[PDB]
Design a protein around this ligand. Structure first.
Ligand SMILES: CCCCCCCC/C=C/CCCCCCCC(=O)OC[C@H](O)CO
Ligand SMILES: CCCCCCCC/C=C\CCCCCCCC(=O)OC[C@H](O)CO
Ligand SMILES: CCCCCCCC/C=C\CCCCCCCC(=O)OC[C@H](O)CO
Ligand SMILES: CCCCCCCC/C=C\CCCCCCCC(=O)OC[C@H](O)CO
Ligand SMILES: *C/C=C(C)/C=C/C=C(C)/C=C/C1=C(C)CCCC1(C)C
Ligand SMILES: *C/C=C(C)/C=C/C=C(C)/C=C/C1=C(C)CCCC1(C)C
Ligand SMILES: CCCCCCCC/C=C/CCCCCCCC(=O)O
Ligand SMILES: CCCCCCCC/C=C\CCCCCCCC(=O)O
Ligand SMILES: CCCCCCCC/C=C\CCCCCCCC(=O)O
Ligand SMILES: CCCCCCCCCCCCCCCCCCCC
Ligand SMILES: CCCCCCCCCCCCCCCCCCCC
Ligand SMILES: CCCCCCCCCCCCCCCCCCCC
Ligand SMILES: CCCCCCCCCCCCCCCCCCCC
Ligand SMILES: CCCCCCCCCCCCCCCCCCCC
Ligand SMILES: CCCCCCCCCCCCCCCCCCCC
Ligand SMILES: CCCCCCCCCCCCCCCCCCCC
Ligand SMILES: CCCCCCCCCCCCCCCCCCCC
Ligand SMILES: CCCCCCCCCCCCCCCCCCCC
Ligand SMILES: CCCCCCCCCCCCCCCCCCCC
Ligand SMILES: CCCCCCCCCCCCCCCCCCCC
Ligand SMILES: CCCCCCCCCCCCCCCCCCCC
Ligand SMILES: CCCCCCCCCCCCCCCCCCCC
Lengths: 254, 254
């Protein structure tokens, strides 16, 4: 049973994560250049099975603003959950092995992040980016249903496994683009792009491992609160790591 | 529900199987070798600079892909109609569940929406992969609605998640038919509009069946009515798409 001291400590950690992300959000908004990545349409120039027009730019992702957005969403929800006003709802949810505000935040913030990673890899088709956003959101919503309908140690991981099936799809997409089957150019994928894909792939797998460990509920993971803390650590570090790598790689003259 | 009522649904599954198997044969025998490309449009400079011309990675053999969604339907309709599955089928129906329906739909409806996307000129391989994944996710949410909720309990959360995932490919189609930023106003063929509009209505009809079942008002309080509606919709939707694709693209000798 989660005590009042334990919940209050978790609220404090949420607040700390919020301040880190809010300050990083300010730093990116202030310091970032106007680097932009295109969303494109490559339209038929006749009936299906004929030829295509050249890709056209439909809109440009303002990368600095998009990084600020996933940091800002994190700050907002970490601050909401940390509030004394929310202690009762937070306590009640943790008692039921749930944190719904976590999934609401992740469904938006992690989806912004994987779209930015896709664009940094050169994925530009607007339907590719929309469907990556949608399938990544679906991964999060499956994790939400795992918490809503199961309890740790009840032997039921079906929603979790559905989440893994949805969750892996964007990463298969990235792997296809970095392999670049049929490519004519001899240009290498930049080192900093490999850094982003590999480090954030590891972070995304870490989130899945937290839910798996929580719902297996073996050893120290029998205590749901250990997973709650792990999620805060992973969201703090994953978001800060992606923001810094995008900033360092694309948003400064250096 | 009466044993007779279930034997009846067994019979209806068999009838649907025979129609789809015969249509599968007809398409395999009669269809031309019409193919739709899956493309990669790779960076040929650092992120935020230049792209190579799109390259064709592979070609969807449209006749074989139509035969595949008809064949998947025939296979699962035959599996569930078997006297050897009558216990497992009856048992699941008794619990307001049909897992074999969702397993089939997760593959067959995903092949269908990818084909519709390609007919609309969506070609980027990540667009088509992520459309497959988000459409499969829509089906898996429908499965979780049946697994975890009871009709009339007021809980449609998995259903609404399925709607969020489910609408994403259709927003994609709408973007490609509007073709924002296009250099010219290239006409979408009438038969393509027929396919998008008819199958959008069919896809909405599937969602309405689950909604009606879990609201559980009127005759829809009887789960077997929805089981029957799903068989009718999968029979008609698949036959309608197969005929429209065949008539639109698979007739002329190439
Ligand atoms: C419940 C009953 C289920 C019944 C199943 C529903 C079938 C839907 C068929 C729609 C065909 C719509 C018309 C498609 C052909 C349009 C031809 C056209 O208008 O051509 C324009 C041309 O491209 C420029 O000149
Ligand atoms: C280089 C060195 C940098 C040094 C940073 C300077 C102060 C930082 C932030 C001030 C704002 C403080 C707000 C952060 C809340 C911290 C918190 O909540 O601590 C746990 C809780 O209070 C326990 O009861
Ligand atoms: C592109 C990607 C799209 C691909 C879509 C594939 C469609 C999935 C079909 C069935 C899924 C099978 C799920 C495996 C079941 C996991 C399991 O066995 O868990 C049982 C649970 O613990 C006790 O309830
Ligand atoms: C709540 C959000 C709902 C939004 C998601 C709904 C998606 C509808 C998709 C297909 C329906 C059929 C589409 C037929 C309408 C096509 C529009 C059109 O005809 O435009 C041509 C264009 O201007 C070039 O000339
Ligand atoms: C800023 C927050 C981030 C990056 C959160 C990421 C979360 C995930 C990658 C979650 C993954 C999960 C699965 C792959 C399976 C189901 C359980 C989840 C939702 C934890
Ligand atoms: C051949 C079989 C087909 C075309 C099946 C299609 C099924 C759907 C479009 C299902 C849609 C659903 C939702 C949009 C929400 C959740 C419930 C579903 C799975 C019935
Ligand atoms: C049996 C379940 C009911 C599902 C509804 C689907 C059937 C109704 C179909 C309507 C198709 C309308 C298509 C009109 C397209 C013409 C436009 C054009 O040619 O430009
Ligand atoms: C500068 C303008 C924006 C500032 C944001 C302030 C956010 C502070 C939220 C405090 C949360 C309350 C709490 O943690 O108890
Ligand atoms: C899910 C699996 C994802 C799709 C795999 C993509 C296959 C790539 C084919 C490369 C062929 C080529 O070299 O042109
Ligand atoms: C219990 C230890 C708390 C230390 C965390 C510091 C609070 C946020 C500061 C971030 C600014 C840099
Ligand atoms: C849900 C997401 C919807 C996507 C909207 C796409 C907007 C495209 C309009 C771009 C303006 C034309 C250049
Ligand atoms: C209920 C109290 C919570 C306050 C939230 C304030 C949100 C500020 C952070 C958002 C950054 C943009
Ligand atoms: C609480 C929900 C409020 C916002 C939900 C809508 C989600 C945003 C959809 C678009 C996200 C980006 C899509 C990428 C390409 C499309 C342009
Ligand atoms: C009921 C719905 C609540 C969903 C909460 C947040 C989900 C956002 C998912 C956005 C998907 C965009 C394609
Ligand atoms: C990158 C986003 C999608 C990730 C999907 C894959 C996540 C897998 C991580 C959790 C699964 C762990 C399975 C463990 C099986 C081995 C035996 C466990 C020992 C207790
Ligand atoms: C709990 C029931 C026991 C059955 C578990 C087996 C089901 C596995 C489902 C596979 C779907 C996962 C897809 C993603 C895997 C990719 C791994 C790469 C990540 C490093
Ligand atoms: C136990 C059956 C495992 C089949 C899983 C199929 C899902 C494919 C995941 C890759 C995307
Ligand atoms: C714990 C956070 C560590 C972030 C990992 C970043 C690794 C990047 C290294 C490759 C980039 C080379 C250019
Ligand atoms: C009980 C009444 C069912 C009538 C059967 C309809 C014909 C099914 C065979 C389809 C083959 C073409
Ligand atoms: C010229 C190529 C020869 C024929 C290949 C046709 C097969 C296409 C399959 C490629 C799949 C790419 C991603 C989109 C669909 C995803 C479906 C797979 C999930 C199980
Ligand atoms: C195209 C695939 C995705 C479809 C998503 C949308 C499906 C919506 C259809 C079912 C929902 C109906 C909601 C009814 C609104 C209120 C009506 C009151 C009567 C109970
Ligand atoms: C209470 C009902 C909330 C419904 C919100 C989810 C709908 C999103 C998908 C609709 C697509 C049409």
């Amino acid at each position: 049973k989660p005590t009042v001291k334990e919940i209050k400590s978790l609220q404090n950690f949420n607040r700390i994560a919020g301040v880190f992300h809010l300050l990083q959000m300010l730093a990116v908004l202030a310091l970032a250049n106007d680097f932009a990545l295109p969303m494109t349409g490559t339209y038929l120039n006749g009936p299906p099975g004929t030829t295509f027009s050249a890709p056209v730019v439909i809109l440009e992702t303002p990368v600095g603003l998009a990084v600020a957005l996933f940091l800002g969403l994190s700050a907002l929800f970490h601050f909401i959950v940390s509030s004394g006003n929310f202690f009762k709802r937070y306590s009640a949810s943790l008692m039921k092995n749930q944190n719904i505000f976590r999934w609401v935040e992740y469904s938006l913030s992690s989806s912004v992040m994987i779209v930015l990673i896709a664009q940094i890899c050169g994925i530009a088709d607007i339907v590719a980016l929309l469907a990556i956003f949608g399938v990544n959101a679906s991964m999060i919503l499956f994790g939400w249903l795992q918490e809503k309908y199961t309890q740790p140690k009840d032997g039921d991981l079906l929603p979790f496994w559905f989440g893994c099936i949805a969750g892996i799809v964007p990463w298969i997409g990235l792997l296809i683009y970095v392999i670049a089957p049929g490519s004519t150019s001899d240009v290498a994928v930049p080192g900093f792009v490999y850094g982003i894909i590999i480090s954030l792939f590891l972070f995304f797998n870490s989130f899945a491992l937290v839910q798996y460990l929580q719902y297996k509920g073996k050893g120290k993971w029998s205590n749901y609160l250990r997973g709650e803390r792990a999620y805060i650590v992973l969201s703090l570090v994953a978001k800060s790591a992606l923001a810094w790598q995008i900033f360092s790689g694309t948003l400064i003259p250096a």
